Amino acid sequence: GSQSTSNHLWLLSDILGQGATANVFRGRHKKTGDLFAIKVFNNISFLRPVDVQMREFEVLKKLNHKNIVKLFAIEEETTTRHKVLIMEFCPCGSLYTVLEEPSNAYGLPESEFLIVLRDVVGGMNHLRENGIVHRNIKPGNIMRVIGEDGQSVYKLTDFGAARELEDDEQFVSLYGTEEYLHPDMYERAVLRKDHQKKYGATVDLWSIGVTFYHAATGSLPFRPFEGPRRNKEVMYKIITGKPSGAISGVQKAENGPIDWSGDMPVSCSLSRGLQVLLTPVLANILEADQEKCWGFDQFFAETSDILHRMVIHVFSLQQMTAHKIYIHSYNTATIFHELVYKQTKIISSNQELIYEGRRLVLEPGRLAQHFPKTTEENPIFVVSREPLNTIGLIYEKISLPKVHPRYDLDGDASMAKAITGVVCYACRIASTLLLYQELMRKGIRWLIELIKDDYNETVHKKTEVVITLDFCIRNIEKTVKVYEKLGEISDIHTKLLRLSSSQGTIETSLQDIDSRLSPGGSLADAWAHQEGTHPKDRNVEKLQVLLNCMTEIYYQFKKDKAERRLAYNEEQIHKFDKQKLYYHATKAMTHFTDECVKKYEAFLNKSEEWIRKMLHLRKQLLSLTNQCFDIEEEVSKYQEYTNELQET
Amino acid sequence: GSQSTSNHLWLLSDILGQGATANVFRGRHKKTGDLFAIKVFNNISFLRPVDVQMREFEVLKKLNHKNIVKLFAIEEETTTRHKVLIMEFCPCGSLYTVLEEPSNAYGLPESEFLIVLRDVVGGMNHLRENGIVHRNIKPGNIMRVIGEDGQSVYKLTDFGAARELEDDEQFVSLYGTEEYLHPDMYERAVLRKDHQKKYGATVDLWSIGVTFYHAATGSLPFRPFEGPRRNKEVMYKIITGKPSGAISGVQKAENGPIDWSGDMPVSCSLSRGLQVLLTPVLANILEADQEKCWGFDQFFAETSDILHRMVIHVFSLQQMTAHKIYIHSYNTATIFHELVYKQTKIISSNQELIYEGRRLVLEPGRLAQHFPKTTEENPIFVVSREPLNTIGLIYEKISLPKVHPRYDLDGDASMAKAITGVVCYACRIASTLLLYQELMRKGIRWLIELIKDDYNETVHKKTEVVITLDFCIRNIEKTVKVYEKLGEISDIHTKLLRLSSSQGTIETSLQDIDSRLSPGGSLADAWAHQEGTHPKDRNVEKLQVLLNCMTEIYYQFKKDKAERRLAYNEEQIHKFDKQKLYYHATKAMTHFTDECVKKYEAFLNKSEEWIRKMLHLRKQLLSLTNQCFDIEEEVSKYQEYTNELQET
Ligand SMILES: O=C(NCCCNc1nc(Nc2cccc(NC(=O)N3CCCC3)c2)ncc1I)c1cccs1
Ligand SMILES: O=C(NCCCNc1nc(Nc2cccc(NC(=O)N3CCCC3)c2)ncc1I)c1cccs1
């Protein structure tokens, strides 16, 4: 069976989505053969008043955006003469399709997540300008397309639950999915509890809030033990009893206590600087009370505050940590040091910056626009003088789910995704560990070369200091000899001889430091090229190979799950590949824990020692340099004492 | 239909390859279900003597290697009781399968090519140790597998043309493919011309030589106008009339002159340093005369000479060129400067090295093993003082093949590969251009910061010079005054006053240079962040997107070519996608020539100017620094003249 129109034709076999009122089919144009999404209304929809079915058509006419799926034309089917919608086709799937990829099981990358935020807001903002509410915002209703620049672009669709609504106009009707439903709408739609309430446009922001937490963590904010489906009552108690500010809540036992948390889970894949901005945003937009809830202006202000911010990559040698500093293009270096202090706890005055081999000096009022180009591979380093605990990288240690001998195809494919998702997360940490050690080797190399510059300039000063002093003591000796031929002077020589003797000891102790900076002087960076891992070890490429064999089985298990039943051939191979998948995953985790992690552990342990070796040396080099300056400001009073004896 | 054995079973539908004597089928083990390649001999093979069919089994028993497809067992078919071979399965295809990928149409990458060389030699070397000749070495007979580390691994197979042969033992029988055939064997196998000749083990090296040229360029060395198939006679005249040393020869007209070349084509994707080692190797192993031909020792010596070499990435700012220096781990920096001079034409003494923000100094005898880690993204820069022409990147400008309105499915899929291969090459150049400009910005930034160090130390010397001079002239004035109270000296003051006046002019002209190094002093690198392209332009990602749409159509055209005939649906869509493929390719080439290339052209033009601005300034800064040293060696004769007047 297949339907057709005047300018379009589609198969009933190609179904993009299946909704209540209508379905959406992958179809082609009759003349050009180009792909378009055809939405066909079923007869059930025609048993609604003439105003409801009118809006959805009058809505798409007024709406056209880059973050909204473009409606090209409205035509009639050849037989039923039903109104069909010619929508823009998005072959890349929906946001739901993306979140099914095992790599995103523990949250989207920091890059693809910001795109989602950028496009969703932009689509919702365009709905706000026209005054259209959606009331059904789910990852399934957010499509994804590949732009000309490769960057993903997200558009909103499925406006079957949409209608024209004024800025302050309320309603009583119900729309939306279960998990992404507002506490007040969940009260009537799921538990069905009428306390005589009305709903504004705040219900859109909740559906957005739940969706956003799902993209960054890989799971829903509020999770009962049985789940939102198996136990609907617990789901409602969490959202209506949630403390103001909390962004998540999960019970870990059947009919037990609920664990609320006002912070992102460690499993998240976002930077620390991004979570600082995100957490308060999710806190206020997620609450039952309309008073404490945010408005669109307060929503857009904070989101546009984040999207306008650029990113300056900063790596701290002292703590061995990587940071993404989210700063505005119009902020100064003063605000920059504040933002770095908030994460790394380093005082603004102790922050010495290093970039591409050289130390970096910042003007107190230079804008962030003119800051040097930074990447994770080549960021700006921050080494402190004040001692700090080397924390390193923090990640949630996650193991493989237990495998049942059960044959359940739905369970195997679901186990396949989960277990492929754990290896994807393990591979993500391994590649991060490799970056930390490599930036460490580059940072330490740059640091020891920088200290040599301090040593060299100090010596140049010491040579400049010793010349003035040796001439001064030589010039007075001639003066006191012509006196004997024909109090102060005696008191001057005492200090001068003591200075020359102390200057001599400095000269010797500086050679000791030079012996420390010398190759193999305990401060050498030769240890770093042994202890930890190297890019030449190709540990990540190894993990990726096993992961390639795992993702091959997983996508095959989906097609086996899609068949519902399998022939004898595909059945027994599925039983065989189930252990092969497990033997691949266990080999990876074994290789991950025994090779990648351990070599990084030993690198972190030997890093702390060298840091303490460095901090000690820079202190001694500091004092000796200051002693050269103390004499420098002392000879300024000396060079004008004896040399000014010849005024007239 | 399907055959089976005692421990194995395979379908006759799954065919890996089809040869003369036997075929190879993708099969599975009965118990484990693991994949193995089953080779089944046809009845035609049984009409050969008992010695010929014996060897191939006795050969695989004696041979087991990492670069040789492992034979696991020899079993008998259930019905025919024919001897079947259980071979190692290589799902990644053969070398022929790899060369069909459009990206490798103009030659393999420098990385995947060296792996081929490493594995082929290693496989051939293991054949040499056992004394087994192959006589059928083709890209189809070289399999590829993904190692545990992700690196490709190539193994030899199809030993149907193989037999035991001593180190000096010859033969008269014939084996091999047409294009990869030795001139003496081509003389009897294709043109069939018996001049009473015998063949040694040199015939293997020719089949290797032709294969290697096919992997680096993407085409065969000797190409007639019609081709090696449509015109067999011309093929023979090229290989038997080839000048000693030439590695290629192509006639560009029907029945016309042959164009010989002893150098790699510009379309090649190998570095300049790798072609220097490769060219002479291909020259001697490719010749009819056994006298001038190379032996395995002379073959292995040069190939192991290359494979033992490491790679030091070097970028020349002066010529705006990237270089791969192939050096041994036991070579010194003396040999290193020689290897750099051979490519960049820069004298060993004028070579000033820069790495990660700082200038690099090399010990005359330091081994290459301890050289700093280098990559293309972070290589060692070489800036000269002697002027050099800025060549930049050199590539062959290749356009799209003309598209016929003809419907020929074989022609369309072949046109699809070719036209997808041109966009792949265009995308390769674009990503290289992006790297050249980025390394240029980093190199120039590092350079101007380095010149500031030279300026600063010169000032420190000038301040050190001016102090001695000002004291010297002050010390003599007191001496000549006590003389008047109670020739040389007069001649000394003349030079001293002239030195102090010249020192004053230096002080002023140094401030001029400081005004040149100052932001916006015509030597600023602010121009580089405007003129050329940036990674933020995402030009490569754009080209990749169109290329993704093209590679989607190409693989679909292969399946359409495989069907031989198409249903009406797939037929007309093929006709529609043919222009869609062309509109994608033309949009890419248009975007490539008007955006990527042009912005790079303007960057190269503004680079030459700044280089001339830099070379001029460093000269003036040099002379002024030398004038400070000239006075320094002049005051050493002065400070011991007047200050030594007080000996007794
Ligand atoms: O409108 C709706 N709901 C929104 C959803 C349907 N709507 C559209 N869906 C696409 N495209 C699309 C979709 C889905 C999945 C995929 N891709 C995959 O799963 N793949 C393909 C590769 C392998 C796995 C591409 N375009 C346009 C539209 I409009 C409604 C559906 C039923 C009532 S309302
Ligand atoms: O031995 C022979 N000649 C060498 C060739 C055949 N021999 C083997 N071939 C594989 N594996 C294989 C092969 C080919 C193609 C591919 N892959 C593809 O084309 N694909 C798959 C993905 C889509 C495109 C994988 N293993 C083992 C062997 I042994 C002979 C063949 C007939 C007489 S002799």
Side-chain angles (χ1 to χ4, degrees):
Chain A
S2 63
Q3 293 179 308
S4 63
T5 59
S6 59
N7 300 331
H8 300 81
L9 186 146
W10 62 94
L11 292 78
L12 288 169
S13 57
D14 303 322
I15 309 179
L16 302 180
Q18 187 177 15
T21 67
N23 308 326
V24 173
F25 307 95
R26 187 197 69 174
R28 310 185 185 95
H29 191 267
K30 283 190 174 182
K31 302 182 184 303
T32 61
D34 296 333
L35 297 174
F36 291 106
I38 289 111
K39 186 176 181 179
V40 185
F41 292 85
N42 298 333
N43 185 33
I44 302 294
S45 60
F46 287 97
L47 286 183
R48 289 183 301 171
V50 205
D51 66 332
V52 178
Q53 240 182 357
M54 174 211 306
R55 290 142 25 188
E56 188 181 11
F57 287 81
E58 303 300 318
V59 159
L60 297 182
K61 291 167 187 176
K62 255 189 175 63
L63 283 161
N64 188 35
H65 200 250
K66 58 173 57 181
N67 301 137
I68 298 294
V69 178
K70 179 181 180 180
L71 177 68
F72 296 93
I74 310 177
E75 303 185 12
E76 292 184 347
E77 204 271 331
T78 46
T79 62
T80 62
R81 302 308 299 178
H82 289 172
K83 300 182 179 182
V84 298
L85 294 178
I86 308 302
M87 303 282 288
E88 171 191 8
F89 180 63
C90 311
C92 304
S94 59
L95 180 64
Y96 174 82
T97 308
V98 179
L99 296 181
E100 274 303 290
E101 296 178 348
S103 59
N104 303 329
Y106 295 102
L108 287 174
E110 75 288 344
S111 56
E112 273 295 318
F113 178 79
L114 295 182
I115 280 186
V116 164
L117 171 67
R118 181 204 64 180
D119 296 331
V120 164
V121 164
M124 172 52 58
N125 177 265
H126 192 245
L127 288 188
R128 182 61 182 182
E129 294 178 0
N130 294 31
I132 305 297
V133 290
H134 197 286
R135 305 171 188 168
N136 199 17
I137 320 170
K138 56 180 170 184
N141 289 343
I142 308 181
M143 308 311 299
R144 177 203 171 198
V145 290
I146 293 300
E148 61 177 359
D149 65 335
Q151 290 284 63
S152 303
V153 174
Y154 293 84
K155 308 184 184 187
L156 297 174
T157 182
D158 187 20
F159 293 95
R163 62 160 293 184
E164 305 187 20
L165 196 68
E166 301 184 21
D167 303 336
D168 66 328
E169 189 179 4
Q170 285 186 324
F171 57 94
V172 77
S173 54
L174 307 177
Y175 295 105
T177 324
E178 284 203 346
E179 297 83 14
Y180 307 96
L181 201 52
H182 194 270
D184 288 333
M185 290 193 60
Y186 191 95
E187 189 179 58
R188 192 179 189 270
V190 179
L191 259 184
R192 316 181 78 130
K193 206 168 190 174
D194 183 34
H195 296 161
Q196 311 283 10
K197 297 182 178 181
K198 298 186 177 183
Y199 333 101
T202 55
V203 294
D204 291 330
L205 296 181
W206 180 277
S207 301
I208 295 175
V210 178
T211 302
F212 277 167
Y213 189 92
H214 182 18
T217 73
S219 298
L220 298 177
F222 320 103
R223 292 183 280 97
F225 184 80
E226 296 84 2
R229 295 180 177 179
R230 320 300 191 276
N231 200 331
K232 296 179 174 183
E233 303 86 329
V234 179
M235 168 64 179
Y236 180 82
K237 188 177 63 61
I238 300 178
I239 59 181
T240 53
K242 197 209 66 165
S244 301
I247 60 180
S248 57
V250 169
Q251 62 171 204
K252 299 162 57 182
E254 181 202 38
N255 196 25
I258 317 286
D259 184 30
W260 296 288
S261 180
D263 215 331
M264 301 293 296
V266 45
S267 62
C268 178
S269 298
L270 296 184
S271 53
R272 191 75 190 112
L274 183 53
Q275 296 184 16
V276 169
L277 296 175
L278 178 58
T279 296
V281 173
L282 295 177
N284 295 118
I285 69 178
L286 293 177
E287 192 165 7
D289 201 339
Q290 295 181 353
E291 291 180 323
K292 310 174 188 177
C293 175
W294 269 1
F296 292 96
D297 286 334
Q298 225 170 356
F299 168 82
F300 180 84
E302 296 291 338
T303 59
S304 57
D305 173 85
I306 301 174
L307 290 174
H308 290 352
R309 286 177 185 271
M310 54 173 56
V311 173
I312 297 181
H313 300 98
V314 173
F315 192 86
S316 179
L317 285 181
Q318 200 67 209
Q319 306 163 343
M320 197 179 178
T321 55
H323 297 265
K324 287 197 190 66
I325 292 298
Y326 283 82
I327 202 175
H328 280 276
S329 179
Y330 52 88
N331 286 18
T332 64
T334 305
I335 315 179
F336 175 76
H337 288 332
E338 174 182 319
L339 294 178
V340 171
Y341 166 75
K342 291 182 62 177
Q343 300 189 30
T344 65
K345 304 152 50 186
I346 311 182
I347 316 180
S348 175
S349 58
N350 293 325
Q351 294 175 10
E352 185 178 6
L353 305 190
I354 303 179
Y355 176 79
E356 286 183 345
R358 303 182 174 273
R359 50 167 54 88
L360 199 58
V361 185
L362 292 186
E363 309 84 324
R366 195 190 188 187
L367 297 184
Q369 180 184 351
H370 309 89
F371 273 54
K373 52 180 183 180
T374 52
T375 329
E376 298 186 80
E377 288 72 19
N378 201 335
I380 298 180
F381 293 100
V382 47
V383 55
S384 180
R385 305 303 300 269
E386 179 180 1
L388 292 169
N389 306 90
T390 83
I391 307 179
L393 178 66
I394 305 181
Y395 63 94
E396 184 175 357
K397 303 181 178 182
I398 306 172
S399 57
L400 305 176
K402 285 124 293 299
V403 177
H404 293 61
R406 186 169 170 86
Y407 167 74
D408 185 32
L409 293 175
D410 304 334
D412 295 344
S414 299
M415 174 272 305
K417 168 179 170 53
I419 205 173
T420 306
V422 180
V423 182
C424 279
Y425 180 82
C427 181
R428 175 186 296 118
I429 305 303
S431 181
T432 301
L433 292 178
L434 179 68
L435 179 65
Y436 270 62
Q437 306 176 41
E438 278 294 287
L439 292 181
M440 215 65 180
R441 296 181 186 93
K442 293 179 56 182
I444 290 176
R445 176 193 299 111
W446 295 354
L447 180 56
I448 64 172
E449 295 291 340
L450 204 68
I451 303 182
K452 289 182 177 183
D453 290 23
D454 297 333
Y455 173 83
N456 292 329
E457 185 173 350
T458 299
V459 170
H460 262 111
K461 262 302 175 180
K462 195 230 67 177
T463 55
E464 283 172 358
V465 161
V466 73
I467 285 179
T468 302
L469 181 63
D470 265 274
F471 164 71
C472 180
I473 62 180
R474 180 180 298 270
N475 195 273
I476 306 181
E477 292 298 328
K478 182 191 176 186
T479 303
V480 295
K481 282 175 182 179
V482 72
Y483 157 73
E484 296 188 4
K485 291 182 178 181
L486 305 187
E488 302 131 316
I489 302 182
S490 62
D491 295 328
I492 287 182
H493 277 170
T494 357
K495 300 178 187 183
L496 288 190
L497 283 180
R498 260 59 180 270
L499 283 183
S500 65
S501 64
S502 62
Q503 174 267 324
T505 59
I506 291 178
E507 157 68 19
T508 58
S509 58
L510 281 179
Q511 296 289 351
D512 165 83
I513 298 183
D514 178 85
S515 181
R516 292 163 136 188
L517 265 58
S518 65
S522 179
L523 204 66
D525 51 7
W527 65 272
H529 299 289
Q530 301 177 3
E531 219 64 29
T533 53
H534 287 71
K536 298 183 180 181
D537 278 340
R538 301 182 60 84
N539 303 323
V540 179
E541 288 88 333
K542 291 179 179 176
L543 291 176
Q544 189 65 28
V545 166
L546 299 182
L547 190 58
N548 286 336
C549 298
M550 291 188 60
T551 190
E552 190 76 14
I553 300 180
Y554 161 67
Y555 278 109
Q556 183 55 45
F557 279 6
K558 294 188 63 60
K559 289 174 295 182
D560 293 334
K561 180 183 177 182
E563 290 289 341
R564 298 183 299 170
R565 71 164 295 100
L566 263 55
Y568 179 82
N569 299 88
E570 291 73 66
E571 172 182 17
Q572 313 305 324
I573 301 179
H574 180 106
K575 297 182 178 181
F576 295 154
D577 295 341
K578 187 174 182 179
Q579 287 192 354
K580 300 177 182 178
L581 181 73
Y582 178 80
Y583 291 155
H584 280 335
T586 51
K587 183 193 305 177
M589 296 302 303
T590 303
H591 178 83
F592 171 69
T593 56
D594 294 336
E595 174 82 0
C596 298
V597 180
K598 285 182 179 302
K599 281 169 166 291
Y600 160 80
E601 300 279 3
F603 192 89
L604 177 61
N605 180 265
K606 278 201 169 184
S607 299
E608 301 187 2
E609 318 298 329
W610 187 91
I611 288 178
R612 297 161 184 172
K613 294 174 187 177
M614 177 268 302
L615 293 179
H616 176 65
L617 184 138
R618 291 195 63 189
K619 170 61 205 306
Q620 293 179 337
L621 185 65
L622 175 65
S623 299
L624 297 180
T625 308
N626 289 128
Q627 291 178 1
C628 290
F629 286 159
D630 293 331
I631 302 178
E632 175 185 291
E633 291 296 331
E634 266 295 327
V635 296
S636 294
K637 223 162 301 179
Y638 292 159
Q639 73 177 0
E640 291 186 345
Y641 197 98
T642 314
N643 186 269
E644 286 194 4
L645 287 179
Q646 311 168 3
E647 287 192 354
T648 300
Chain B
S2 63
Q3 293 179 308
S4 63
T5 59
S6 59
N7 300 331
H8 300 81
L9 186 146
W10 62 94
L11 292 78
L12 288 169
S13 57
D14 303 322
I15 309 179
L16 302 180
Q18 187 177 15
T21 67
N23 308 326
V24 173
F25 307 95
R26 187 197 69 174
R28 310 185 185 95
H29 191 267
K30 283 190 174 182
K31 302 182 184 303
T32 61
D34 296 333
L35 297 174
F36 291 106
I38 289 111
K39 186 176 181 179
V40 185
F41 292 85
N42 298 333
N43 185 33
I44 302 294
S45 60
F46 287 97
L47 286 183
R48 289 183 301 171
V50 205
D51 66 332
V52 178
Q53 240 182 357
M54 174 211 306
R55 290 142 25 188
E56 188 181 11
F57 287 81
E58 303 300 318
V59 159
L60 297 182
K61 291 167 187 176
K62 255 189 175 63
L63 283 161
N64 188 35
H65 200 250
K66 58 173 57 181
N67 301 137
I68 298 294
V69 178
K70 179 181 180 180
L71 177 68
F72 296 93
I74 310 177
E75 303 185 12
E76 292 184 347
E77 204 271 331
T78 46
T79 62
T80 62
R81 302 308 299 177
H82 289 172
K83 300 182 179 182
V84 298
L85 294 178
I86 308 302
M87 303 282 288
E88 171 191 8
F89 180 63
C90 311
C92 304
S94 59
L95 180 64
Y96 174 82
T97 308
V98 179
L99 296 181
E100 274 303 290
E101 296 178 348
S103 59
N104 303 329
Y106 295 102
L108 287 174
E110 75 288 344
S111 56
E112 273 295 318
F113 178 79
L114 295 182
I115 280 186
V116 164
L117 171 67
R118 181 204 64 180
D119 296 331
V120 164
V121 164
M124 172 52 58
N125 177 265
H126 192 245
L127 288 188
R128 182 61 182 182
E129 294 178 0
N130 294 31
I132 305 297
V133 290
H134 197 286
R135 305 171 188 168
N136 199 17
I137 320 170
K138 56 180 170 184
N141 289 343
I142 308 181
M143 308 311 299
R144 177 203 171 198
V145 290
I146 293 300
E148 61 177 359
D149 65 334
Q151 290 284 63
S152 303
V153 174
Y154 293 84
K155 308 184 184 187
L156 297 174
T157 182
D158 187 20
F159 293 95
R163 62 160 293 184
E164 305 187 20
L165 196 68
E166 301 184 21
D167 303 336
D168 66 328
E169 189 179 4
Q170 285 186 324
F171 57 94
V172 77
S173 54
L174 307 177
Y175 295 105
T177 324
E178 284 203 346
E179 297 83 14
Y180 307 96
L181 201 52
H182 194 270
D184 288 333
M185 290 193 60
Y186 191 95
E187 189 179 58
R188 192 179 189 270
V190 179
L191 259 184
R192 316 181 78 130
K193 206 168 190 174
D194 183 34
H195 296 161
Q196 311 283 10
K197 297 182 178 181
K198 298 186 177 183
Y199 333 101
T202 55
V203 294
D204 291 330
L205 296 181
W206 180 277
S207 301
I208 295 175
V210 178
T211 302
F212 277 167
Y213 189 92
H214 182 18
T217 73
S219 298
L220 298 177
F222 320 103
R223 292 183 280 97
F225 184 80
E226 296 84 2
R229 295 180 177 179
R230 320 300 191 276
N231 200 331
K232 296 179 174 183
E233 303 86 329
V234 179
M235 168 64 179
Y236 180 82
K237 188 177 63 61
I238 300 178
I239 59 181
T240 53
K242 197 209 66 165
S244 301
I247 60 180
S248 57
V250 169
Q251 62 171 204
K252 299 162 57 182
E254 181 202 38
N255 196 25
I258 317 286
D259 184 30
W260 296 288
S261 180
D263 215 331
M264 301 293 296
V266 45
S267 62
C268 178
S269 298
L270 296 184
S271 53
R272 191 75 190 112
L274 183 53
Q275 296 184 16
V276 169
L277 296 175
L278 178 58
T279 296
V281 173
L282 295 177
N284 295 118
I285 69 178
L286 293 177
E287 192 165 7
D289 201 339
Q290 295 181 353
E291 291 180 323
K292 310 174 188 177
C293 175
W294 269 1
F296 292 97
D297 286 334
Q298 225 170 356
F299 168 82
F300 180 84
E302 296 291 338
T303 59
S304 57
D305 173 85
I306 301 174
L307 290 174
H308 290 352
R309 286 177 185 271
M310 54 173 56
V311 173
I312 297 181
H313 300 98
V314 173
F315 192 86
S316 179
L317 285 181
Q318 200 67 209
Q319 306 163 343
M320 197 179 178
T321 55
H323 297 265
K324 287 197 190 66
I325 292 298
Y326 283 82
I327 202 175
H328 280 276
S329 179
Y330 52 88
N331 286 18
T332 64
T334 305
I335 315 179
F336 175 76
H337 288 332
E338 174 182 319
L339 294 178
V340 171
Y341 166 75
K342 291 182 62 177
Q343 300 189 30
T344 65
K345 304 152 50 186
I346 311 182
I347 316 180
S348 175
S349 58
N350 293 325
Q351 294 175 10
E352 185 178 6
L353 305 190
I354 303 179
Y355 176 79
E356 286 183 345
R358 303 182 174 273
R359 50 167 54 88
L360 199 58
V361 185
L362 292 186
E363 309 84 324
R366 195 190 188 187
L367 297 184
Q369 180 184 351
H370 309 89
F371 273 54
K373 52 180 183 180
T374 52
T375 329
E376 298 186 80
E377 288 72 19
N378 201 335
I380 298 180
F381 293 100
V382 47
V383 55
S384 180
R385 305 303 300 269
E386 179 180 1
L388 292 169
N389 306 90
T390 83
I391 307 179
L393 178 66
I394 305 181
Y395 63 94
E396 184 175 357
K397 303 181 178 182
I398 306 172
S399 57
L400 305 176
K402 285 124 293 299
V403 177
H404 293 61
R406 186 169 170 86
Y407 167 74
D408 185 32
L409 293 175
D410 304 334
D412 295 344
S414 299
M415 174 272 305
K417 168 179 170 53
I419 205 173
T420 306
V422 180
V423 182
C424 279
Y425 180 82
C427 181
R428 175 186 296 118
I429 305 303
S431 181
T432 301
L433 292 178
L434 179 68
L435 179 65
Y436 270 62
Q437 306 176 41
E438 278 294 287
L439 292 181
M440 215 65 180
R441 296 181 186 93
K442 293 179 56 182
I444 290 176
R445 176 193 299 111
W446 295 354
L447 180 56
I448 64 172
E449 295 291 340
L450 204 68
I451 303 182
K452 289 182 177 183
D453 290 23
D454 297 333
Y455 173 83
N456 292 329
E457 185 173 350
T458 299
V459 170
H460 262 111
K461 262 302 175 180
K462 195 230 67 177
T463 55
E464 283 172 358
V465 161
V466 73
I467 285 178
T468 302
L469 181 63
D470 265 274
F471 164 71
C472 180
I473 62 180
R474 180 180 298 270
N475 195 273
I476 306 181
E477 292 298 328
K478 182 191 176 186
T479 303
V480 295
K481 282 175 182 179
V482 72
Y483 157 73
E484 296 187 4
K485 291 182 178 181
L486 305 186
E488 302 131 316
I489 302 182
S490 62
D491 295 328
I492 287 182
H493 277 170
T494 357
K495 300 178 187 183
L496 288 190
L497 283 180
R498 260 59 180 270
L499 283 183
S500 65
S501 64
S502 62
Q503 174 267 324
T505 59
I506 291 178
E507 157 68 19
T508 58
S509 58
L510 281 179
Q511 296 289 351
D512 165 83
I513 298 183
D514 178 85
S515 181
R516 292 163 136 188
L517 265 58
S518 65
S522 179
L523 204 66
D525 51 7
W527 65 272
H529 299 289
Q530 301 177 3
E531 219 64 29
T533 53
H534 287 71
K536 298 183 180 181
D537 278 340
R538 301 182 60 84
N539 303 323
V540 179
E541 288 88 333
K542 291 179 179 176
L543 291 176
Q544 189 65 28
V545 166
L546 299 182
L547 190 58
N548 286 336
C549 298
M550 292 188 60
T551 190
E552 190 76 14
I553 300 180
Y554 161 67
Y555 278 109
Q556 183 55 45
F557 279 6
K558 294 188 63 60
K559 289 174 295 182
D560 293 334
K561 180 183 177 182
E563 290 289 341
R564 298 183 299 170
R565 71 164 295 100
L566 263 55
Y568 179 82
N569 299 88
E570 291 73 66
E571 172 182 17
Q572 313 305 324
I573 301 179
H574 180 106
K575 297 182 178 181
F576 295 154
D577 295 341
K578 187 174 182 179
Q579 287 192 354
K580 300 177 182 178
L581 181 73
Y582 178 80
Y583 291 155
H584 280 335
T586 51
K587 183 193 305 177
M589 296 302 303
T590 303
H591 178 83
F592 171 69
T593 56
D594 294 336
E595 174 82 0
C596 298
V597 180
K598 285 182 179 302
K599 281 169 166 291
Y600 160 80
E601 300 279 3
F603 192 89
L604 177 61
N605 180 265
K606 278 201 169 184
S607 299
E608 301 187 2
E609 318 298 329
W610 187 91
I611 288 178
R612 297 161 184 172
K613 294 174 187 177
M614 177 268 302
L615 293 179
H616 176 65
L617 184 138
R618 291 195 63 189
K619 170 61 205 306
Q620 293 179 337
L621 185 65
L622 175 64
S623 299
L624 297 180
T625 308
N626 289 128
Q627 291 178 1
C628 290
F629 286 159
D630 293 331
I631 302 178
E632 175 185 291
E633 291 296 331
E634 266 295 327
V635 296
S636 294
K637 223 162 301 179
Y638 292 159
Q639 73 177 0
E640 291 186 345
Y641 197 98
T642 314
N643 186 269
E644 286 194 4
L645 287 179
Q646 311 168 3
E647 287 192 354
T648 300

